[PDB]
Amino acid sequence: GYNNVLQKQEITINIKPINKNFELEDIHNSLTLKNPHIEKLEVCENIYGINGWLTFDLAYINNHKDFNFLLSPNQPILLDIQINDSFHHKRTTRFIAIGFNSNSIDIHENGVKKFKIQFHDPLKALWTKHKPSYIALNKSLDDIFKDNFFFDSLFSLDTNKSNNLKIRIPQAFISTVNRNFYDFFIQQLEQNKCYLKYFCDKKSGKVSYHVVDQVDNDLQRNIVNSDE
Amino acid sequence: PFLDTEITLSKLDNDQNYLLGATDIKSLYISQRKLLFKRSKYCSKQLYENHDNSITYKIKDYSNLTPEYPKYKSFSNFYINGRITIGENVNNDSKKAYKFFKNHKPEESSIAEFQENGEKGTSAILNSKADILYAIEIAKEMLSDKSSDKPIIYLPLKVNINSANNQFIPLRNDDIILIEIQSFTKGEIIELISNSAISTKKAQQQLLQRQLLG
Amino acid sequence: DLKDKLSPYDISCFKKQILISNKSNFYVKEKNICPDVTLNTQRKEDRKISDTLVKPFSSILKDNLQSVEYIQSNNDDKQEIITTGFEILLTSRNTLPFLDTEITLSKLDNDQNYLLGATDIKSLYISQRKLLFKRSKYCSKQLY
Amino acid sequence: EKGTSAILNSKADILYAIEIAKEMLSDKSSDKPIIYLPLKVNINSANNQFIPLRNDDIILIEIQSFTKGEIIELISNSAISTKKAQQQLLQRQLLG
């Protein structure tokens, strides 16, 4: 502590499992955190994405509510982080992210267990482990990106404002040879010189990306910060 | 407090010189954050038996507003084998002929009518012009599983494949070709994996050296 | 006295029980494509998995293409989808008694749940060691 | 090789006059840009044909090191069917 005029700082974490068919389940139906069991969390923001780490503590061995989340690789995990601070007046920040990775679980003991989970914004952490390579004909780009996008019980992406990606192309060569499809989402987006916008709704959490070829009032009609 | 430390694509006015900056700079914005939220030694002790903060900001000029892209990977090339066809119902007099295509549609063309006009002029190509295409049928298993379209990719001409600087033997149909895809929307034609004339005897009965034509 | 099953003079000597990845529950499809005209069979085939009870995801692929040469391309270099394993680090401050802490290609039975692990796991083995042998400040001073 | 008329190993010290576009010299050089390069004899040919590189053709040239250039492909012709592939089917060799 030893600060002024910070009154309170309460931070929460909401954790759900994500099934085979990319919908949600219930384990308060989740593993909420508290008066912090958290040693350390790291978050960086961008216009496009979120990264970082998360460490926390639990107890003990064993309980069936803790088995399915943190004892297996390759199960996707929502991480709803809310930060709420009061001073006077209150201000809130909120994060939504998915973290799963193959071939990596970090757990420590010495009945207190440690854990280490990473962060990506949900379009990245899903399309990383997804490598198609095929040919399309007579299809524009926004026709392509929604053919690979199978996520509507999680979030949505808003491509209705660009009017450059919807130009038709007769020969398409989608190629992920040694690389990631999420790179292909960004590389050809660079050669059309567009914007990405990660955006959370604090009330309530519904992530929706935005791709606008300029910067206008219409985006600024949708970063209206729900504060006073 | 009292700011917008939440990423908007907006403006923030400037009157105080309590940044380093420069005095001739108008409105700014915020492009990043970083968040190091640790756990102090106070909250740890009662919760082990039974926080600290640091926030940075990235601030740039509003007049230099550019999109920001993370690091990505430029891709490499994969090889596709494919045929050449002309139409779909081919006579047996004109079974091995050649046809040139205009504009990504099944339309006849010539080497002429394009011929950037240092070439009209006689019959001599310089620089091996684009916008003349080959109908190439590719094995159906590289399209999507919903596509009800017959797979034909058009590609430009290397005229110097079945030839030299004198011969004009264009690619007939019903041959087999390695195709690179060197970038997005740029394919190329490299080698031939095909023939029409071979000695089918045991290299002691015959010694054939021939050119079939036409 | 080569004994097994972690007789509890050993749990007096431990410091950490570090996990690395356990067995998973979901894999990723790997459709295997030979891009060729004039191979009159299937081109797309799934790669095979040596274990059951693991379901794929939905509509997410790793299209492993195969490069094509002038040669009639062969078949098939039949690899398999890498299932995840099970790795435990165990930092002990000294050599362990009553075990076989010497690399055999053998079995070691499991009855005690004093690992993190999972309760449905039979016999184990040892695949590495690490050895950090330093010199304390006691033995250094009289020998300097 | 003396001997008959048969090259082994495609000898060096025989060169081709190659004119290059003037915009890769320095801006003071009053010299007409011609770089000499050795022969790949096996370009317009096979193991039997001898059709050497005539003038007035167009060639990709790599420069693989310092003082080592090579000749790779041809971007040129002299004989083409300038009709619409339904009126004619030309298959010819101009020569000489």
UniProtKB/TrEMBL annotation, chain A:
Protein origin, superkingdom: Bacteria
Protein name per Swiss-Prot or TrEMBL: PdpA
Organism: Francisella novicida
Covered range of the whole protein: 172 to 435 of 820
TrEMBL record, chain D:
Top-level taxon: Bacteria
This protein's name: PdpA
Gene, per the UniProt record: pdpA
Residues of the full protein shown: 677 to 772 of 820
